[PDB]
Amino acid sequence: PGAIRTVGVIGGGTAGYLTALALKAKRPWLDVALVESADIPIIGVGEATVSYMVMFLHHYLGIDPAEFYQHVRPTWKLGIRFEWGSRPEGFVAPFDWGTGSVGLVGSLRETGNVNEATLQAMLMTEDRVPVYRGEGGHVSLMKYLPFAYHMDNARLVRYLTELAARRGVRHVDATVAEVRLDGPDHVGGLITTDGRRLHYDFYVDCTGFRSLLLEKALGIPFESYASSLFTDAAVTGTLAHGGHLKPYTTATTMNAGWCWTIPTPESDHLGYVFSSAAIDPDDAAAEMARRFPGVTREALVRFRSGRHREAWRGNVMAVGNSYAFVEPLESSGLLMIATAVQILVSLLPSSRRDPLPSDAANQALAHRWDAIRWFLSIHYRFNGRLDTPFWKEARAETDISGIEPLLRLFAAGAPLTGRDSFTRYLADGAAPLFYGLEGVDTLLLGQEVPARLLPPREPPEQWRARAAAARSLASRGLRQSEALDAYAADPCLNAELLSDSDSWAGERVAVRAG
Amino acid sequence: PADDDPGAIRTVGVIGGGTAGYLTALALKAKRPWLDVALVESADIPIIGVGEATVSYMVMFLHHYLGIDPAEFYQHVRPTWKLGIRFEWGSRPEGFVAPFDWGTGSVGLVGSLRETGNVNEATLQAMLMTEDRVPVYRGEGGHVSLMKYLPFAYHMDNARLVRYLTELAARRGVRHVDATVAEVRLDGPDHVGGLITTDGRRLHYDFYVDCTGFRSLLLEKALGIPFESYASSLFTDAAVTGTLAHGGHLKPYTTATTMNAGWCWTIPTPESDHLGYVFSSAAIDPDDAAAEMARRFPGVTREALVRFRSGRHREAWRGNVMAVGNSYAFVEPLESSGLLMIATAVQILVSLLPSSRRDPLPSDAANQALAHRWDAIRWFLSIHYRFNGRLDTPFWKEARAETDISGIEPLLRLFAAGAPLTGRDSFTRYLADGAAPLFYGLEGVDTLLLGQEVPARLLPPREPPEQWRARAAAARSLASRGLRQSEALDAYAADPCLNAELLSDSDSWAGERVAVRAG
Numbered sequence A: 001p002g003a004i005r006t007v008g009v010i011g012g013g014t015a016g017y018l019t020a021l022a023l024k025a026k027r028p029w030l031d032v033a034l035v036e037s038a039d040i041p042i043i044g045v046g047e048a049t050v051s052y053m054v055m056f057l058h059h060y061l062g063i064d065p066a067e068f069y070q071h072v073r074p075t076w077k078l079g080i081r082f083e084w085g086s087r088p089e090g091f092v093a094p095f096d097w098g099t100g101s102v103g104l105v106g107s108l109r110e111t112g113n114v115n116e117a118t119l120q121a122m123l124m125t126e127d128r129v130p131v132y133r134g135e136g137g138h139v140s141l142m143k144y145l146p147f148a149y150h151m152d153n154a155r156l157v158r159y160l161t162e163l164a165a166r167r168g169v170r171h172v173d174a175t176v177a178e179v180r181l182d183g184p185d186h187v188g189g190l191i192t193t194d195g196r197r198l199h200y201d202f203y204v205d206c207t208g209f210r211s212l213l214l215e216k217a218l219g220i221p222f223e224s225y226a227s228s229l230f231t232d233a234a235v236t237g238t239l240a241h242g243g244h245l246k247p248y249t250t251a252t253t254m255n256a257g258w259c260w261t262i263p264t265p266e267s268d269h270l271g272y273v274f275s276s277a278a279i280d281p282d283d284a285a286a287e288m289a290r291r292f293p294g295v296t297r298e299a300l301v302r303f304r305s306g307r308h309r310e311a312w313r314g315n316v317m318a319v320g321n322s323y324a325f326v327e328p329l330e331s332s333g334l335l336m337i338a339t340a341v342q343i344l345v346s347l348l349p350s351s352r353r354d355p356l357p358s359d360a361a362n363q364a365l366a367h368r369w370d371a372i373r374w375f376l377s378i379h380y381r382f383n384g385r386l387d388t389p390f391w392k393e394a395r396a397e398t399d400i401s402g403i404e405p406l407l408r409l410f411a412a413g414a415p416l417t418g419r420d421s422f423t424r425y426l427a428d429g430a431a432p433l434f435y436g437l438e439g440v441d442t443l444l445l446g447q448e449v450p451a452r453l454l455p456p457r458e459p460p461e462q463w464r465a466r467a468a469a470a471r472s473l474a475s476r477g478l479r480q481s482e483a484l485d486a487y488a489a490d491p492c493l494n495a496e497l498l499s500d501s502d503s504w505a506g507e508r509v510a511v512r513a514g
Numbered sequence B: 001p002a003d004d005d006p007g008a009i010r011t012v013g014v015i016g017g018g019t020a021g022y023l024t025a026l027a028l029k030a031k032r033p034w035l036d037v038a039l040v041e042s043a044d045i046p047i048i049g050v051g052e053a054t055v056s057y058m059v060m061f062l063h064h065y066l067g068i069d070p071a072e073f074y075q076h077v078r079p080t081w082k083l084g085i086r087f088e089w090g091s092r093p094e095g096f097v098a099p100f101d102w103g104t105g106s107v108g109l110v111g112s113l114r115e116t117g118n119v120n121e122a123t124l125q126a127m128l129m130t131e132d133r134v135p136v137y138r139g140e141g142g143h144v145s146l147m148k149y150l151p152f153a154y155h156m157d158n159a160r161l162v163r164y165l166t167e168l169a170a171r172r173g174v175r176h177v178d179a180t181v182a183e184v185r186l187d188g189p190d191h192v193g194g195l196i197t198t199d200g201r202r203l204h205y206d207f208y209v210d211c212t213g214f215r216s217l218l219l220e221k222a223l224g225i226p227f228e229s230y231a232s233s234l235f236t237d238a239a240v241t242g243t244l245a246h247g248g249h250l251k252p253y254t255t256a257t258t259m260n261a262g263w264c265w266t267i268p269t270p271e272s273d274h275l276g277y278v279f280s281s282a283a284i285d286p287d288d289a290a291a292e293m294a295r296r297f298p299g300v301t302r303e304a305l306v307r308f309r310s311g312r313h314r315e316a317w318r319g320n321v322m323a324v325g326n327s328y329a330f331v332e333p334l335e336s337s338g339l340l341m342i343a344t345a346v347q348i349l350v351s352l353l354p355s356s357r358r359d360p361l362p363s364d365a366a367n368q369a370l371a372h373r374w375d376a377i378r379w380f381l382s383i384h385y386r387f388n389g390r391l392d393t394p395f396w397k398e399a400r401a402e403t404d405i406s407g408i409e410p411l412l413r414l415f416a417a418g419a420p421l422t423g424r425d426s427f428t429r430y431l432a433d434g435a436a437p438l439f440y441g442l443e444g445v446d447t448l449l450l451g452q453e454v455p456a457r458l459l460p461p462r463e464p465p466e467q468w469r470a471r472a473a474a475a476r477s478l479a480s481r482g483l484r485q486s487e488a489l490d491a492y493a494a495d496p497c498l499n500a501e502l503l504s505d506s507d508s509w510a511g512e513r514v515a516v517r518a519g
Ligand SMILES: Cc1cc2nc3c(=O)[nH]c(=O)nc-3n(C[C@H](O)[C@H](O)[C@H](O)COP(=O)(O)OP(=O)(O)OC[C@H]3O[C@@H](n4cnc5c(N)ncnc54)[C@H](O)[C@@H]3O)c2cc1C
Pocket: B015, B016, B017, B018, B019, B020, B021, B040, B041, B042, B043, B044, B045, B046, B047, B048, B049, B050, B051, B052, B053, B054, B179, B180, B181, B182, B211, B212, B213, B214, B215, B217, B239, B276, B306, B307, B308, B324, B325, B326, B327, B332, B333, B336, B337, B338, B339, B340
């Protein structure tokens, strides 16, 4: 009948492949085709992620962790090191927060900074990881301390494409020349440059920034985040690291933006995200080369920060850059693809006659992205590190209006995570899901935004003893490169991460969200 | 709160003496006992006189947050118990029941629908309600109460409640001022400088709470905060109240009965049933409403006509004024959210009140939180009206055709594709959640929609039918052996440790440990 039986995923990036894999994993009766152009290249960049993504890949898509490691060769991300704000040494922003908490107010009072708030924060400052050569073999605390991956993009996409073929996704080589509608909010088919006509019951727009189905064919307008987020290009390249693998992404303040450093086994991958209005791309490249002597110059990529009004209209939903994008300052790109895919796979109707839940999907995604926007806005507003024209404009004119009510709450009594339960609960709704009140507090305290600090409620010497047990675990951790070789040598180390009842990424916790 | 600071907030004037004003004054003095807290009220403008049913949270608020001793409360207020709402509503001749005990009391909604054709075996409290019994049992040489395991609320005679709260406030050092405010005098942008009484006294406080009821003297009238009507969804605007004898038989629930131009509550007190026919005055004259009520509930007295409007103000807090209760917002008492929302506004104020006029003012956070909570309640109430197929009167035809449900329509589309929403996968449940009211939840939306036979694809069960049946039979067993309410209330009056275990036991839904967590 009108059963939705076929789905065409249009575009093959990480967005396309994540989408096709989920549809096959959860609705294996669907016929799922992934359509991509061998001549229009995929965007090429989003390489760091967040801890949730580890569970998405392994539990939700059922990707074997031994085979993932061998094919993609990921490195570990314990958080982000911010060379950011007016503290000469900057600050670290770790993923752990419950099981790893040592104490934020104690860090600030003992140390004047947030860099001892947690066990991962201390691991970051040591460039070490919570894996230990314990006579016997290895002993890993990774299963207790949430972490994420850095993944070389080319390798990740190759592996996902191999996976799709296994799981019975059909591949179509083709360039879409036109999207033909056959009714108001309804794609009737796709005409390729070579004259084929492709028809599916449902279309997923993963065509990147061009947004061929969502924006161009269905006319869904774009909503700019430009009053908050002023950058619009990036110069990328690579820099040798001598085999020393920093267990974090770095975000470094630059004259007209900021530069990421993302470690892979072969080398560090860099990107100077900048405002075109504030500097010429060549000049940005020259500044990058000067700041990072030895870095190559590989590519200029342009983007715009914002989302479309709608992700899902009619028989089309957009996943990835065809819907929305923000700069990778908090590595939210893959997170939001995964959120969108989970929405589609959950909500996709059984038949064409059914009640279409596009409004709910639209609202859900608008809410999520708009909260990320306001979280990013406070990275810009409060960055006192440099006094260039870009940074003066960012401190004076960044729009923070959507998070201003939470900032006032922080001003009155920080950290928000140290407030009474009711206030914490109330503040929670302004904070991005996933990044949480803890990420807002880290950024605000890290940048020394004026606030009334809360009383420690607990005596100094106590925090101090927690601090020492943590520091001692931290400096005894292995160096990352050794630890990764241990994981490759013992596949049963990843398998414990996923099975264990007490793992942060265990089967138990997985079920409790997907 | 520093001793030096000539900028400190030291005095608070709570303007108004209904339940909103007394609860606010008691909360301020309990949690910030250094404040000088004054309650101002006019002997010449009576309180509204009518809000008697509550939700399970209110039990914790009263006893934990305000430190009200339960034996004393029982002695002075003489509450009855509310296990839920009985809805004589929708097209099922028997109606349906909506209990508070989803979770610990769950038997299963899908199994109840498949095996019984309705929702009334979805939980243990649903079975207690249809038995008119309560989960208290004569044990060997005592009483065994399962009240600590199953969330419940109070019904409270309004005149006794107010008198008790008034007594408590005096005993705890709240100052009383008898005055009729004539003018709220501003002394700057967003700043009340003082109040002038009708006789010419000038009252001044560092902070004001507007508890003036619908008139909203400080918030709306002085500060100009505008009103946002919920009238596209909620069309009733009047109630006729009265009492009806019950023989001493105390129903363990509030009843909501569909009427020709609205609906009628039945709230048990120990002395009689308290009733109110909530109606659209556009649809029926008040005397004709009173006549209908006497047809439907023969013997009922006619006590009072009360008028109201459904909606909220744009903001609750501006500068040195916060509004609590009907001064801020109101919806008809179909889900008894009034006291809940008062309690929520109080916690907001008590937590967020600055120590001094220099401190940052978190009034936008308070306003957004309150707007979101009230708006969600609005849309939940909207679906009680849109889908009530019980009667074919012009009021009910209009309701079914024109009730604005826009704000919950995306959630209704989800429901239709696979009900109950509480049976969906975890990700879908979390997404759906965001449209449901925080206290009432997806379970409340599911119960109202399935109770009213709103078409949907019913989800398959997740367990063999015999397992549901076994669990139902265990529950039916317990429900049929419960005491009648009136005997059980006598047990609680006789033995204060029943309430003590409810409030202290780590296993209790209303225990210390849950209280600490809820703030
Ligand atoms: C019909 C109906 C049924 C309801 N049912 C329920 C229910 O079952 N459960 C529930 O939880 N809620 C219910 N509510 C809401 C609940 O009733 C609250 O008690 C009440 O409606 C609001 O209390 P209040 O203190 O805000 O206002 P009021 O009780 O109106 O008090 C206002 C106070 O302000 C004072 N005041 C006003 N103007 C001045 C002035 N100029 N100077 C000095 N003082 C002044 C008055 O003297 C009075 O003391 C219901 C409401 C209505 C209308």
